[PDB]
């Protein structure tokens, strides 16, 4: 550990933007659409769409862990604490060569294969007061989730029920104990944000996460169900996360696509409610892959040599 006190701000961390831009370029030479459409305006309202048609090679895009080592004239500083807001003065900081192996998983609503919370479930937010700022949840115990191009994902109803609890409890432990915690599905928006979207085998899965976010701080949902089955769908025409615009990928082909990932975290986003009675409603969120990266770099910060 480094014997000094420094400031950290994962919400304004620059490595996030440095990885994000990398992960995008890690996408332009691995997953290339058959056609990519992107807004093109002079400002005069009228906006032509810039079209691009390239080969559409079916590649089973399988993410490789990524390290981030400071070159020279630069040093990475890691924060150490069982519960770090990731936005303030860190006491147990410590210089490191490369950040832990991170598997740049691009997804929405659920953070897959990320890094678990050592102690307990932690939830960071650039401002919990602002019903506009994504709440990044960090699970201390991942929940396996298996998706298949066959059309769905299975999740443990047990583990997911617990998780919502040990999350619902960490929420009120920030918005007011004497406050009811509820979970509802997406409010609306793009398919990629409304469902738990992500990529598996180069196939863009779109799983309906209603059964994962319709939890009332009162009842249950395990009648005749041992596992939660999200009705997933693979799309060819998708909205790009790298930049405003659609992109069409070629249909599936491999006799079988399969994924078994660790739900290591979520991206929630409680609704304003305009100071109404203690009844905070949290819904799935994300779509801004940087929050993802953040959830992984929340305790890092590269700095110039002295």
Partner 1 sequence: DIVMTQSPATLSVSPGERATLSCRASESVSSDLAWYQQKPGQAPRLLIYGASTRATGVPARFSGSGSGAEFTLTISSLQSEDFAVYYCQQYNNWPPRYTFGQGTRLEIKRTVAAPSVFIFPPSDEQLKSGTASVVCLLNNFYPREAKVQWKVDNALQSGNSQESVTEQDSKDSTYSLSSTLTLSKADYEKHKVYACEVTHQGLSSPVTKSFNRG
Residues engaged in binding ligand NAG (CB under 6 A): 1, 3, 5, 40, 48, 80, 91-92, 103, 105, 112-113, 120-121, 140-142, 144, 146, 154, 156-158, 166, 170, 178, 194-195, 198, 200, 208, 210-211, 214-216, 219-222, 225-227, 231, 259-262, 276-278
**Minimum distance, C-beta of residue 130 to ligand NAG, in the bound complex (Å):** 21
Give CA separation, 143 vs 29, 103, 138, 182, 216, in Å: 31, 17, 12, 20, 20
Distance CA 245, CA 299 (A): 32
Phi and psi (nearest 5°) for 261? -115, 165
Our measurement of the distance from residue 115's CA atom to the centroid of its chain's CA atoms, rounded to an integer in Å, reads: 12
Nearer to partner 1, 176 or 251 (CB): 251
**Minimum distance, C-beta of residue 255 to partner 1, in the bound complex (Å):** 15
Residue 211 touches which of partner 1, ligand NAG, none (Cβ within 5-8 Å per kind): ligand NAG
Rg over CA atoms, the chain:
20
| Closest residue to ligand NAG: CB criterion | 178
**Contacts to partner 1 from residues 7-36, by CB under 8 A:** 34
Phi and psi (nearest 5°) for 83? -150, 90
Residue 183 touches which of ligand NAG, partner 1, none (Cβ within 5-8 Å per kind): none
How would you label 33-55 residue by residue, b for 16+ Cβ within 10 Å and e otherwise?
bbebbeeeeeeeeeeeeeeeeee
Residue 158 touches which of partner 1, ligand NAG, none (Cβ within 5-8 Å per kind): ligand NAG
Residue 53 touches which of ligand NAG, partner 1, none (Cβ within 5-8 Å per kind): partner 1
Distance CA 127, CA 35 (A): 39
Structure tokens at 206: 């779109």
**Contacts to partner 1 from residues 205-264, by CB under 8 A:** 250
Query: Is residue 92 at the binding interface for partner 1, with CB under 8 A as the rule?
Result: no
**Minimum distance, C-beta of residue 72 to ligand NAG, in the bound complex (Å):** 26
Query: Is residue 56 at the binding interface for partner 1, with CB under 8 A as the rule?
Result: yes
**Minimum distance, C-beta of residue 208 to ligand NAG, in the bound complex (Å):** 3
Give CA separation, 77 vs 68, 74, 141, 176, 180, in Å: 12, 10, 26, 33, 39
Query: Is residue 50 at the binding interface for partner 1, with CB under 8 A as the rule?
Result: no
Nearer to ligand NAG, 70 or 257 (CB): 257
Distance CA 154, CA 28 (A): 30
| Helix ranges restricted to H, 90-212 | 157-175, 191-194
Is 280 within 8 Å of 48 (Cβ atoms)?
no
**Minimum distance, C-beta of residue 195 to ligand NAG, in the bound complex (Å):** 6
Question: Judged by CB under 8 A, which of 5, 53, 222, 276 binds partner 1?
Answer: 53
Is 111 within 8 Å of 123 (Cβ atoms)?
no
Residues that bind partner 1 (CB under 8 A): 34, 53-56, 250
């Amino acid at each position: 550990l480094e014997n000094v006190t420094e400031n950290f701000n994962m919400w304004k961390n620059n490595m996030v933007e440095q990885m994000h831009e990398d992960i995008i370029s890690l996408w332009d030479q691995s997953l290339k659409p058959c056609v990519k459409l992107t807004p093109l305006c002079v400002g005069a309202g009228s906006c032509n769409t810039s079209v691009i048609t390239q080969a559409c090679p079916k590649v089973s895009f399988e993410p490789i862990p990524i390290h981030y080592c400071a070159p020279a004239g630069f040093a990475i500083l890691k924060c150490n604490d069982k519960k770090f807001n990731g936005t303030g003065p860190c006491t147990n900081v410590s210089t490191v060569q490369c950040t832990h192996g991170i598997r740049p998983v691009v997804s929405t609503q659920l953070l897959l294969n990320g890094s678990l919370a050592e102690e307990e479930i932690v939830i960071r937010s650039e401002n919990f007061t602002n019903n506009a700022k994504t709440i990044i949840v960090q699970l201390n115990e991942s929940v396996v989730i298996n998706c298949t191009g066959a059309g769905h994902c299975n999740l443990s109803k047990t583990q997911w029920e617990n998780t919502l609890e040990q999350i619902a409890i960490k929420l009120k432990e920030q918005f007011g104990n004497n406050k009811t915690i509820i979970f509802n599905p997406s409010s609306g928006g793009d398919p990629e944000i409304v469902t738990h979207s992500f990529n598996c085998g180069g196939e863009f899965f779109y799983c309906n996460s209603t059964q994962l976010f319709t939890w009332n701080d009162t009842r249950k949902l395990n009648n005749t169900g041992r596992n939660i089955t999200l009705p997933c769908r693979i799309k060819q025409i998708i909205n790009m996360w790298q930049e405003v615009g659609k992109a069409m990928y070629a249909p599936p082909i491999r006799g079988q696509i399969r994924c078994s990932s660790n739900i290591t975290g979520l991206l929630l986003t409680r609704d304003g409610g305009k100071d109404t009675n203690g009844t905070e409603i949290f819904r799935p969120g994300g779509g801004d892959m940087r929050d993802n990266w953040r959830s992984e770099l929340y305790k890092y910060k590269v700095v110039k040599i002295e």
